[PDB]
Write a protein that binds this ligand. Sequence first.
Ligand SMILES: Nc1ncnc2c1ncn2[C@@H]1O[C@H](COP(=O)(O)OP(=O)(O)O)[C@@H](O)[C@H]1O
Lengths: 443, 63
Amino acid sequence: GLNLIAAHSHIRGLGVDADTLEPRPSSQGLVGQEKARKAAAVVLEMIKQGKIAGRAVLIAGPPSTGKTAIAMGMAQSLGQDVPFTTLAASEIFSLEMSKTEALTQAFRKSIGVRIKEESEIMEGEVVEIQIDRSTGGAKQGKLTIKTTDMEAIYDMGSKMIDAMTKERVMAGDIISIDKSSGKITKLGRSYARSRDYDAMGVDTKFLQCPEGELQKRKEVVHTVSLHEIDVINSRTQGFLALFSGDTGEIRSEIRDQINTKVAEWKEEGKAEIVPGVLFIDEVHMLDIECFSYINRALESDLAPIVIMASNRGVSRIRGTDYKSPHGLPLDFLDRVVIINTHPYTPDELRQILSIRAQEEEVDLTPDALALLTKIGQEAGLRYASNLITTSQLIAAKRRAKQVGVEDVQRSFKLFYDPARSVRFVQESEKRLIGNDGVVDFSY
Amino acid sequence: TNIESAPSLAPMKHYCDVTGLPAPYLDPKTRLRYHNKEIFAMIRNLPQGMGEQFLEARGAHTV
Ligand SMILES: Nc1ncnc2c1ncn2[C@@H]1O[C@H](COP(=O)(O)OP(=O)(O)O)[C@@H](O)[C@H]1O
């Protein structure tokens, strides 16, 4: 389909026992990180219960130790039933709006309002339409429609005749009508009428006739975030700004009205509130002004849970000239708990490479897997996973059925790992452009 | 003068010819109003002349 194989495609969840939250050594695509996966499992319980507002959790660890993997696992284990917002900290630096506006919007995307609405919907195959136009049109008309179980004629009101003529409804069309509003959606064409569709090209698909009652009270569940209600209320077609993105700095009195309105809907039972989670990857790319904002945005009943990932050691905080753990100010780290991820052992590297090799279409000989595991220990898990794809393509070019050691060795030779590439720049130092801008082009 | 009422101009509610329950549907073939797929099935399996017998209770028989 459209969804190609990405770096995280093998992650289907957290791999955790729902009863005890004990992580299994491998499941759902996650290997090891058990203490970290247990802690991420405790955070899901908090998210799903909704009781607690504005906890901030930091996932701290070296690069390529599964900080994003665990973040993908949580998203997959919440599923579509909860707002999950994934923010790269680089995105907050909009030109359309201030940083704190962008952080408010991100927080507001992560609280959902869940609303349940019924409609009667009428669905069936059209047996007939007749319309009498006299000559101004739409003077009267009759619809005959059926399922496999029922058939009916309807006398049509003139605006339904306009809807029918707009959507060019003809005999054999399978249509649905949202009769509370009168939009027609043409679900398809009946196979039993295929010869009538003389204009439809051979690529045309045909459906079977619908079934059961012609009319059903379908119930729809909507979730709309607080940010969507804010943007709707910003201008005459404000909802369009949910797509073009040209929301200005939406005025805070609009948001306060909406916060009041939603608390009203909660007490009346007209709506339910669904606290989601905001994930901020590379939280160290935020600056000191962002952190002092987030401090107080967390202290609100309409705050999501926030989850953050950092690779950084004791490092300079952006927007200041001093250094702090994770690159984050201690004022902020006081309101955070840290989950730390460790480096993998070789048997975990083997399993992760195997899962990555099964997610990709790669038949891998045992010695190639052993070799890739050695490379993983020495060059890093990402480099070895990148070599899987390469060796498959090399094996394929020589028409081989399996990736052998021979193919991994071509890959290792053709594509340098980070450490080999660092040596290359150190040995090539006069030929590369140095930090002083000096370079020599001569042989 | 023994001439003393007139038809309503309010639109008319639709009731099932079989069971009198509210009827969303009017059968094209037999002109009976029916409540649901169960009664449509029964309506289409009526004996000869029973469809007219149901219209007679509504005063709508073919004559
Ligand atoms: N414990 C794990 N189980 C399965 N796959 C993992 C695990 N840890 C990392 N990976 C995979 O290896 C790659 C590197 O880890 P990732 O989490 O992206 O790095 P980082 O921790 O720097 O964000 C990713 O493709 C990720 O899906």
